[PDB]
């Protein structure tokens, strides 16, 4: 149907906008702390602590499959990256501190993404 095609074009354009957002958030992690999944070889107990692991590579895979239907779903995954880290790691660690900085810097990016999503529809 033509309606299905138009809905698919909207998803495509949302995917384009979320790719630019993703790139801008990942720039706020210059140490690459959040780039890849926590390795279960290296942290064997991780899934006893963290029930829904997340990282920027995992988000990129979902994005490229057009697997975010709206900005809320994308933000949920980003918040998992931050929130997971701040539970597993203590305050005095480079990991926790990286997460705080990513959260604070990323909030600015996401505030304008939300206006763009609503604006363009």
mmCIF file of N, CA and C in Angstrom:
data_model
loop_
_atom_site.group_PDB
_atom_site.id
_atom_site.type_symbol
_atom_site.label_atom_id
_atom_site.label_comp_id
_atom_site.label_asym_id
_atom_site.label_seq_id
_atom_site.Cartn_x
_atom_site.Cartn_y
_atom_site.Cartn_z
ATOM 1 N N UNK A 1 0.844 -1.191 0.000
ATOM 2 C CA UNK A 1 0.000 0.000 0.000
ATOM 3 C C UNK A 1 0.857 1.209 0.000
ATOM 4 N N UNK A 2 0.343 2.307 -0.499
ATOM 5 C CA UNK A 2 1.084 3.507 -0.440
ATOM 6 C C UNK A 2 1.228 4.037 1.006
ATOM 7 N N UNK A 3 0.223 3.781 1.852
ATOM 8 C CA UNK A 3 0.275 4.222 3.256
ATOM 9 C C UNK A 3 1.500 3.533 3.959
ATOM 10 N N UNK A 4 1.648 2.248 3.663
ATOM 11 C CA UNK A 4 2.799 1.476 4.242
ATOM 12 C C UNK A 4 4.115 2.006 3.810
ATOM 13 N N UNK A 5 4.273 2.324 2.532
ATOM 14 C CA UNK A 5 5.466 3.022 2.066
ATOM 15 C C UNK A 5 5.768 4.366 2.732
ATOM 16 N N UNK A 6 4.682 5.127 2.976
ATOM 17 C CA UNK A 6 4.889 6.468 3.601
ATOM 18 C C UNK A 6 5.349 6.305 5.067
ATOM 19 N N UNK A 7 4.773 5.317 5.732
ATOM 20 C CA UNK A 7 5.165 4.996 7.121
ATOM 21 C C UNK A 7 6.606 4.522 7.157
ATOM 22 N N UNK A 8 6.963 3.718 6.171
ATOM 23 C CA UNK A 8 8.375 3.259 6.029
ATOM 24 C C UNK A 8 9.336 4.394 5.722
ATOM 25 N N UNK A 9 8.909 5.383 4.938
ATOM 26 C CA UNK A 9 9.759 6.546 4.724
ATOM 27 C C UNK A 9 9.974 7.385 6.018
ATOM 28 N N UNK A 10 8.922 7.562 6.776
ATOM 29 C CA UNK A 10 8.997 8.247 8.113
ATOM 30 C C UNK A 10 9.998 7.492 8.966
ATOM 31 N N UNK A 11 9.924 6.171 9.033
ATOM 32 C CA UNK A 11 10.916 5.384 9.854
ATOM 33 C C UNK A 11 12.328 5.579 9.368
ATOM 34 N N UNK A 12 12.529 5.615 8.040
ATOM 35 C CA UNK A 12 13.802 5.900 7.478
ATOM 36 C C UNK A 12 14.347 7.240 7.867
ATOM 37 N N UNK A 13 13.527 8.278 7.831
ATOM 38 C CA UNK A 13 13.996 9.580 8.179
ATOM 39 C C UNK A 13 14.260 9.641 9.720
ATOM 40 N N UNK A 14 13.430 9.007 10.485
ATOM 41 C CA UNK A 14 13.731 8.957 11.974
ATOM 42 C C UNK A 14 15.085 8.288 12.209
ATOM 43 N N UNK A 15 15.346 7.175 11.482
ATOM 44 C CA UNK A 15 16.622 6.463 11.567
ATOM 45 C C UNK A 15 17.746 7.362 11.213
ATOM 46 N N UNK A 16 17.607 8.201 10.157
ATOM 47 C CA UNK A 16 18.663 9.165 9.814
ATOM 48 C C UNK A 16 18.934 10.155 10.943
ATOM 49 N N UNK A 17 17.878 10.664 11.516
ATOM 50 C CA UNK A 17 18.018 11.659 12.592
ATOM 51 C C UNK A 17 18.682 10.981 13.838
ATOM 52 N N UNK A 18 18.206 9.788 14.211
ATOM 53 C CA UNK A 18 18.820 9.009 15.352
ATOM 54 C C UNK A 18 20.254 8.621 15.077
ATOM 55 N N UNK A 19 20.660 8.412 13.810
ATOM 56 C CA UNK A 19 22.065 8.181 13.549
ATOM 57 C C UNK A 19 22.912 9.411 13.861
ATOM 58 N N UNK A 20 22.461 10.616 13.509
ATOM 59 C CA UNK A 20 23.180 11.818 13.781
ATOM 60 C C UNK A 20 23.249 12.011 15.354
ATOM 61 N N UNK A 21 22.111 11.772 15.999
ATOM 62 C CA UNK A 21 22.067 11.824 17.504
ATOM 63 C C UNK A 21 23.059 10.837 18.090
ATOM 64 N N UNK A 22 23.043 9.613 17.628
ATOM 65 C CA UNK A 22 23.957 8.583 18.152
ATOM 66 C C UNK A 22 25.423 9.009 18.008
ATOM 67 N N UNK A 23 25.756 9.582 16.838
ATOM 68 C CA UNK A 23 27.104 10.012 16.625
ATOM 69 C C UNK A 23 27.516 11.118 17.511
ATOM 70 N N UNK A 24 26.613 12.049 17.751
ATOM 71 C CA UNK A 24 26.855 13.156 18.650
ATOM 72 C C UNK A 24 26.996 12.675 20.115
ATOM 73 N N UNK A 25 26.201 11.709 20.534
ATOM 74 C CA UNK A 25 26.370 11.182 21.925
ATOM 75 C C UNK A 25 27.636 10.423 22.073
ATOM 76 N N UNK A 26 28.004 9.603 21.100
ATOM 77 C CA UNK A 26 29.222 8.817 21.195
ATOM 78 C C UNK A 26 30.500 9.680 21.186
ATOM 79 N N UNK A 27 30.391 10.863 20.591
ATOM 80 C CA UNK A 27 31.514 11.818 20.701
ATOM 81 C C UNK A 27 31.765 12.297 22.128
ATOM 82 N N UNK A 28 30.764 12.260 22.998
ATOM 83 C CA UNK A 28 30.869 12.632 24.372
ATOM 84 C C UNK A 28 31.494 11.541 25.234
ATOM 85 N N UNK A 29 31.958 10.461 24.577
ATOM 86 C CA UNK A 29 32.664 9.325 25.257
ATOM 87 C C UNK A 29 33.957 9.139 24.573
ATOM 88 N N UNK A 30 34.859 10.138 24.790
ATOM 89 C CA UNK A 30 36.091 9.985 23.972
ATOM 90 C C UNK A 30 37.065 8.843 24.393
ATOM 91 N N UNK A 31 36.911 8.369 25.625
ATOM 92 C CA UNK A 31 37.666 7.239 26.085
ATOM 93 C C UNK A 31 37.141 5.882 25.529
ATOM 94 N N UNK A 32 35.979 5.897 24.837
ATOM 95 C CA UNK A 32 35.405 4.657 24.317
ATOM 96 C C UNK A 32 35.017 3.631 25.378
ATOM 97 N N UNK A 33 34.704 4.129 26.593
ATOM 98 C CA UNK A 33 34.279 3.300 27.692
ATOM 99 C C UNK A 33 33.005 2.556 27.392
ATOM 100 N N UNK A 34 32.148 3.187 26.590
ATOM 101 C CA UNK A 34 30.768 2.645 26.343
ATOM 102 C C UNK A 34 30.618 2.111 24.912
ATOM 103 N N UNK A 35 31.713 2.003 24.162
ATOM 104 C CA UNK A 35 31.667 1.596 22.796
ATOM 105 C C UNK A 35 31.239 0.212 22.518
ATOM 106 N N UNK A 36 31.561 -0.741 23.385
ATOM 107 C CA UNK A 36 31.329 -2.144 23.144
ATOM 108 C C UNK A 36 30.625 -2.815 24.375
ATOM 109 N N UNK A 37 30.012 -3.957 24.183
ATOM 110 C CA UNK A 37 29.465 -4.660 25.346
ATOM 111 C C UNK A 37 30.466 -5.023 26.379
ATOM 112 N N UNK A 38 30.115 -4.948 27.648
ATOM 113 C CA UNK A 38 30.955 -5.532 28.687
ATOM 114 C C UNK A 38 31.216 -6.988 28.387
ATOM 115 N N UNK A 39 32.488 -7.369 28.362
ATOM 116 C CA UNK A 39 32.867 -8.759 28.034
ATOM 117 C C UNK A 39 32.634 -9.773 29.225
ATOM 118 N N UNK A 40 31.883 -10.845 28.990
ATOM 119 C CA UNK A 40 31.590 -11.814 30.021
ATOM 120 C C UNK A 40 32.766 -12.683 30.223
ATOM 121 N N UNK A 41 33.708 -12.674 29.271
ATOM 122 C CA UNK A 41 34.972 -13.369 29.564
ATOM 123 C C UNK A 41 35.733 -12.631 30.632
ATOM 124 N N UNK A 42 35.827 -11.299 30.516
ATOM 125 C CA UNK A 42 36.509 -10.423 31.451
ATOM 126 C C UNK A 42 35.769 -10.028 32.782
ATOM 127 N N UNK A 43 34.429 -9.999 32.708
ATOM 128 C CA UNK A 43 33.574 -9.739 33.871
ATOM 129 C C UNK A 43 32.537 -10.854 33.945
ATOM 130 N N UNK A 44 32.952 -12.037 34.435
ATOM 131 C CA UNK A 44 32.084 -13.181 34.343
ATOM 132 C C UNK A 44 30.760 -13.108 35.124
ATOM 133 N N UNK A 45 30.763 -12.322 36.187
ATOM 134 C CA UNK A 45 29.573 -12.170 37.051
ATOM 135 C C UNK A 45 28.663 -11.045 36.534
ATOM 136 N N UNK A 46 28.969 -10.436 35.381
ATOM 137 C CA UNK A 46 28.219 -9.195 35.063
ATOM 138 C C UNK A 46 26.695 -9.333 35.018
ATOM 139 N N UNK A 47 26.173 -10.437 34.484
ATOM 140 C CA UNK A 47 24.761 -10.563 34.272
ATOM 141 C C UNK A 47 24.071 -10.926 35.610
ATOM 142 N N UNK A 48 24.833 -11.231 36.663
ATOM 143 C CA UNK A 48 24.222 -11.362 37.996
ATOM 144 C C UNK A 48 23.852 -9.969 38.507
ATOM 145 N N UNK A 49 24.589 -8.917 38.064
ATOM 146 C CA UNK A 49 24.402 -7.522 38.500
ATOM 147 C C UNK A 49 23.459 -6.774 37.565
ATOM 148 N N UNK A 50 23.679 -6.892 36.291
ATOM 149 C CA UNK A 50 23.049 -6.037 35.285
ATOM 150 C C UNK A 50 22.161 -6.938 34.374
ATOM 151 N N UNK A 51 20.862 -6.665 34.486
ATOM 152 C CA UNK A 51 19.961 -7.529 33.769
ATOM 153 C C UNK A 51 19.751 -7.196 32.295
ATOM 154 N N UNK A 52 19.977 -5.922 31.893
ATOM 155 C CA UNK A 52 19.803 -5.527 30.545
ATOM 156 C C UNK A 52 21.087 -4.685 30.123
ATOM 157 N N UNK A 53 22.149 -5.383 29.788
ATOM 158 C CA UNK A 53 23.353 -4.696 29.299
ATOM 159 C C UNK A 53 23.104 -3.873 28.035
ATOM 160 N N UNK A 54 23.854 -2.787 27.865
ATOM 161 C CA UNK A 54 23.702 -1.984 26.664
ATOM 162 C C UNK A 54 25.031 -1.237 26.407
ATOM 163 N N UNK A 55 25.247 -0.893 25.160
ATOM 164 C CA UNK A 55 26.479 -0.223 24.732
ATOM 165 C C UNK A 55 26.261 0.404 23.333
ATOM 166 N N UNK A 56 27.151 1.255 22.883
ATOM 167 C CA UNK A 56 26.881 1.980 21.670
ATOM 168 C C UNK A 56 26.917 1.062 20.411
ATOM 169 N N UNK A 57 27.752 0.037 20.362
ATOM 170 C CA UNK A 57 27.714 -0.889 19.236
ATOM 171 C C UNK A 57 26.392 -1.618 19.099
ATOM 172 N N UNK A 58 25.830 -2.036 20.222
ATOM 173 C CA UNK A 58 24.554 -2.716 20.274
ATOM 174 C C UNK A 58 23.486 -1.753 19.783
ATOM 175 N N UNK A 59 23.531 -0.484 20.197
ATOM 176 C CA UNK A 59 22.523 0.474 19.751
ATOM 177 C C UNK A 59 22.667 0.693 18.220
ATOM 178 N N UNK A 60 23.872 0.750 17.743
ATOM 179 C CA UNK A 60 24.105 0.999 16.297
ATOM 180 C C UNK A 60 23.520 -0.145 15.487
ATOM 181 N N UNK A 61 23.698 -1.368 15.960
ATOM 182 C CA UNK A 61 23.107 -2.573 15.261
ATOM 183 C C UNK A 61 21.573 -2.458 15.199
ATOM 184 N N UNK A 62 20.952 -2.107 16.303
ATOM 185 C CA UNK A 62 19.510 -1.900 16.338
ATOM 186 C C UNK A 62 19.089 -0.763 15.413
ATOM 187 N N UNK A 63 19.773 0.348 15.450
ATOM 188 C CA UNK A 63 19.459 1.474 14.627
ATOM 189 C C UNK A 63 19.520 1.107 13.152
ATOM 190 N N UNK A 64 20.565 0.432 12.741
ATOM 191 C CA UNK A 64 20.764 0.139 11.291
ATOM 192 C C UNK A 64 19.751 -0.864 10.726
ATOM 193 N N UNK A 65 19.151 -1.686 11.570
ATOM 194 C CA UNK A 65 18.013 -2.490 11.269
ATOM 195 C C UNK A 65 16.680 -1.711 11.364
ATOM 196 N N UNK A 66 16.749 -0.378 11.484
ATOM 197 C CA UNK A 66 15.531 0.429 11.804
ATOM 198 C C UNK A 66 14.684 -0.072 12.953
ATOM 199 N N UNK A 67 15.339 -0.492 14.062
ATOM 200 C CA UNK A 67 14.687 -1.048 15.157
ATOM 201 C C UNK A 67 14.278 -0.104 16.274
ATOM 202 N N UNK A 68 14.443 1.214 16.073
ATOM 203 C CA UNK A 68 13.869 2.194 16.967
ATOM 204 C C UNK A 68 12.604 2.813 16.299
ATOM 205 N N UNK A 69 11.491 2.621 16.937
ATOM 206 C CA UNK A 69 10.219 3.148 16.356
ATOM 207 C C UNK A 69 9.979 4.600 16.684
ATOM 208 N N UNK A 70 10.586 5.078 17.781
ATOM 209 C CA UNK A 70 10.405 6.445 18.229
ATOM 210 C C UNK A 70 11.657 6.833 19.071
ATOM 211 N N UNK A 71 11.752 8.101 19.399
ATOM 212 C CA UNK A 71 12.890 8.603 20.165
ATOM 213 C C UNK A 71 12.884 7.984 21.580
ATOM 214 N N UNK A 72 11.738 7.761 22.174
ATOM 215 C CA UNK A 72 11.652 7.217 23.556
ATOM 216 C C UNK A 72 12.402 5.877 23.661
ATOM 217 N N UNK A 73 12.223 5.007 22.674
ATOM 218 C CA UNK A 73 12.919 3.727 22.679
ATOM 219 C C UNK A 73 14.458 3.860 22.622
ATOM 220 N N UNK A 74 14.928 4.801 21.830
ATOM 221 C CA UNK A 74 16.334 5.126 21.660
ATOM 222 C C UNK A 74 16.855 5.682 22.985
ATOM 223 N N UNK A 75 16.137 6.625 23.562
ATOM 224 C CA UNK A 75 16.569 7.120 24.870
ATOM 225 C C UNK A 75 16.590 6.072 25.951
ATOM 226 N N UNK A 76 15.680 5.147 25.954
ATOM 227 C CA UNK A 76 15.719 4.041 26.926
ATOM 228 C C UNK A 76 17.050 3.261 26.900
ATOM 229 N N UNK A 77 17.530 2.986 25.683
ATOM 230 C CA UNK A 77 18.794 2.260 25.491
ATOM 231 C C UNK A 77 19.948 3.164 25.970
ATOM 232 N N UNK A 78 19.940 4.454 25.579
ATOM 233 C CA UNK A 78 21.006 5.311 26.091
ATOM 234 C C UNK A 78 21.049 5.402 27.601
ATOM 235 N N UNK A 79 19.926 5.521 28.201
ATOM 236 C CA UNK A 79 19.858 5.580 29.682
ATOM 237 C C UNK A 79 20.349 4.245 30.302
ATOM 238 N N UNK A 80 20.147 3.104 29.663
ATOM 239 C CA UNK A 80 20.683 1.854 30.161
ATOM 240 C C UNK A 80 22.199 1.848 30.223
ATOM 241 N N UNK A 81 22.818 2.422 29.170
ATOM 242 C CA UNK A 81 24.290 2.517 29.173
ATOM 243 C C UNK A 81 24.736 3.225 30.451
ATOM 244 N N UNK A 82 24.179 4.392 30.726
ATOM 245 C CA UNK A 82 24.574 5.238 31.856
ATOM 246 C C UNK A 82 24.215 4.541 33.179
ATOM 247 N N UNK A 83 22.940 4.126 33.267
ATOM 248 C CA UNK A 83 22.437 3.610 34.531
ATOM 249 C C UNK A 83 23.086 2.296 34.980
ATOM 250 N N UNK A 84 23.386 1.446 34.015
ATOM 251 C CA UNK A 84 24.088 0.152 34.255
ATOM 252 C C UNK A 84 25.465 0.442 34.885
ATOM 253 N N UNK A 85 26.146 1.417 34.241
ATOM 254 C CA UNK A 85 27.518 1.754 34.707
ATOM 255 C C UNK A 85 27.526 2.313 36.092
ATOM 256 N N UNK A 86 26.562 3.196 36.351
ATOM 257 C CA UNK A 86 26.495 3.823 37.672
ATOM 258 C C UNK A 86 26.030 2.885 38.793
ATOM 259 N N UNK A 87 25.486 1.746 38.460
ATOM 260 C CA UNK A 87 25.208 0.731 39.487
ATOM 261 C C UNK A 87 26.421 -0.224 39.692
ATOM 262 N N UNK A 88 26.992 -0.719 38.590
ATOM 263 C CA UNK A 88 28.084 -1.671 38.715
ATOM 264 C C UNK A 88 29.352 -1.090 39.305
ATOM 265 N N UNK A 89 29.629 0.167 38.910
ATOM 266 C CA UNK A 89 30.867 0.836 39.326
ATOM 267 C C UNK A 89 30.681 1.792 40.428
ATOM 268 N N UNK A 90 31.621 1.961 41.341
ATOM 269 C CA UNK A 90 31.498 2.927 42.451
ATOM 270 C C UNK A 90 31.784 4.316 42.019
ATOM 271 N N UNK A 91 31.327 5.297 42.801
ATOM 272 C CA UNK A 91 31.541 6.742 42.535
ATOM 273 C C UNK A 91 32.940 7.178 42.248
ATOM 274 N N UNK A 92 33.934 6.557 42.877
ATOM 275 C CA UNK A 92 35.328 6.934 42.775
ATOM 276 C C UNK A 92 36.050 6.329 41.575
ATOM 277 N N UNK A 93 35.326 5.835 40.575
ATOM 278 C CA UNK A 93 35.936 5.152 39.481
ATOM 279 C C UNK A 93 35.856 5.952 38.197
ATOM 280 N N UNK A 94 36.814 5.721 37.289
ATOM 281 C CA UNK A 94 36.792 6.396 36.001
ATOM 282 C C UNK A 94 35.531 6.021 35.200
ATOM 283 N N UNK A 95 35.029 4.796 35.406
ATOM 284 C CA UNK A 95 33.830 4.370 34.695
ATOM 285 C C UNK A 95 32.607 5.155 35.084
ATOM 286 N N UNK A 96 32.366 5.220 36.420
ATOM 287 C CA UNK A 96 31.191 5.979 36.894
ATOM 288 C C UNK A 96 31.260 7.436 36.439
ATOM 289 N N UNK A 97 32.466 8.026 36.594
ATOM 290 C CA UNK A 97 32.653 9.442 36.302
ATOM 291 C C UNK A 97 32.416 9.675 34.793
ATOM 292 N N UNK A 98 32.835 8.734 33.968
ATOM 293 C CA UNK A 98 32.612 8.836 32.473
ATOM 294 C C UNK A 98 31.089 8.840 32.194
ATOM 295 N N UNK A 99 30.372 7.995 32.932
ATOM 296 C CA UNK A 99 28.924 7.940 32.753
ATOM 297 C C UNK A 99 28.217 9.240 33.149
ATOM 298 N N UNK A 100 28.637 9.836 34.271
ATOM 299 C CA UNK A 100 28.083 11.105 34.662
ATOM 300 C C UNK A 100 28.300 12.164 33.572
ATOM 301 N N UNK A 101 29.519 12.226 33.068
ATOM 302 C CA UNK A 101 29.851 13.210 32.032
ATOM 303 C C UNK A 101 29.082 12.988 30.745
ATOM 304 N N UNK A 102 28.924 11.721 30.371
ATOM 305 C CA UNK A 102 28.101 11.355 29.181
ATOM 306 C C UNK A 102 26.668 11.700 29.363
ATOM 307 N N UNK A 103 26.075 11.430 30.548
ATOM 308 C CA UNK A 103 24.729 11.828 30.856
ATOM 309 C C UNK A 103 24.524 13.355 30.735
ATOM 310 N N UNK A 104 25.442 14.129 31.308
ATOM 311 C CA UNK A 104 25.262 15.589 31.397
ATOM 312 C C UNK A 104 25.392 16.190 30.028
ATOM 313 N N UNK A 105 26.396 15.755 29.288
ATOM 314 C CA UNK A 105 26.634 16.241 27.918
ATOM 315 C C UNK A 105 25.590 15.732 26.950
ATOM 316 N N UNK A 106 25.141 14.520 27.116
ATOM 317 C CA UNK A 106 24.145 13.946 26.217
ATOM 318 C C UNK A 106 22.765 14.552 26.405
ATOM 319 N N UNK A 107 22.451 15.033 27.610
ATOM 320 C CA UNK A 107 21.122 15.638 27.886
ATOM 321 C C UNK A 107 20.890 16.830 26.966
ATOM 322 N N UNK A 108 21.939 17.572 26.704
ATOM 323 C CA UNK A 108 21.832 18.749 25.846
ATOM 324 C C UNK A 108 21.416 18.341 24.387
ATOM 325 N N UNK A 109 22.077 17.301 23.895
ATOM 326 C CA UNK A 109 21.858 16.747 22.568
ATOM 327 C C UNK A 109 20.435 16.223 22.470
ATOM 328 N N UNK A 110 20.007 15.486 23.500
ATOM 329 C CA UNK A 110 18.695 14.895 23.473
ATOM 330 C C UNK A 110 17.573 15.911 23.628
ATOM 331 N N UNK A 111 17.832 16.996 24.340
ATOM 332 C CA UNK A 111 16.810 18.029 24.453
ATOM 333 C C UNK A 111 16.473 18.571 23.046
ATOM 334 N N UNK A 112 17.461 18.755 22.167
ATOM 335 C CA UNK A 112 17.157 19.337 20.886
ATOM 336 C C UNK A 112 16.636 18.273 19.911
ATOM 337 N N UNK A 113 17.047 17.019 20.047
ATOM 338 C CA UNK A 113 16.530 15.929 19.264
ATOM 339 C C UNK A 113 15.037 15.772 19.450
ATOM 340 N N UNK A 114 14.597 15.909 20.674
ATOM 341 C CA UNK A 114 13.157 15.838 20.988
ATOM 342 C C UNK A 114 12.373 16.960 20.286
ATOM 343 N N UNK A 115 12.894 18.166 20.323
ATOM 344 C CA UNK A 115 12.211 19.238 19.589
ATOM 345 C C UNK A 115 12.190 18.908 18.072
ATOM 346 N N UNK A 116 13.292 18.430 17.466
ATOM 347 C CA UNK A 116 13.380 18.083 16.011
ATOM 348 C C UNK A 116 12.413 16.974 15.598
ATOM 349 N N UNK A 117 12.308 15.953 16.445
ATOM 350 C CA UNK A 117 11.373 14.868 16.222
ATOM 351 C C UNK A 117 9.940 15.355 16.192
ATOM 352 N N UNK A 118 9.546 16.161 17.183
ATOM 353 C CA UNK A 118 8.203 16.773 17.268
ATOM 354 C C UNK A 118 7.954 17.768 16.130
ATOM 355 N N UNK A 119 8.928 18.646 15.907
ATOM 356 C CA UNK A 119 8.891 19.613 14.799
ATOM 357 C C UNK A 119 8.646 18.953 13.403
ATOM 358 N N UNK A 120 9.581 18.104 12.934
ATOM 359 C CA UNK A 120 9.466 17.444 11.608
ATOM 360 C C UNK A 120 8.331 16.411 11.578
ATOM 361 N N UNK A 121 7.885 15.957 12.751
ATOM 362 C CA UNK A 121 6.845 14.932 12.867
ATOM 363 C C UNK A 121 7.488 13.564 12.737
#
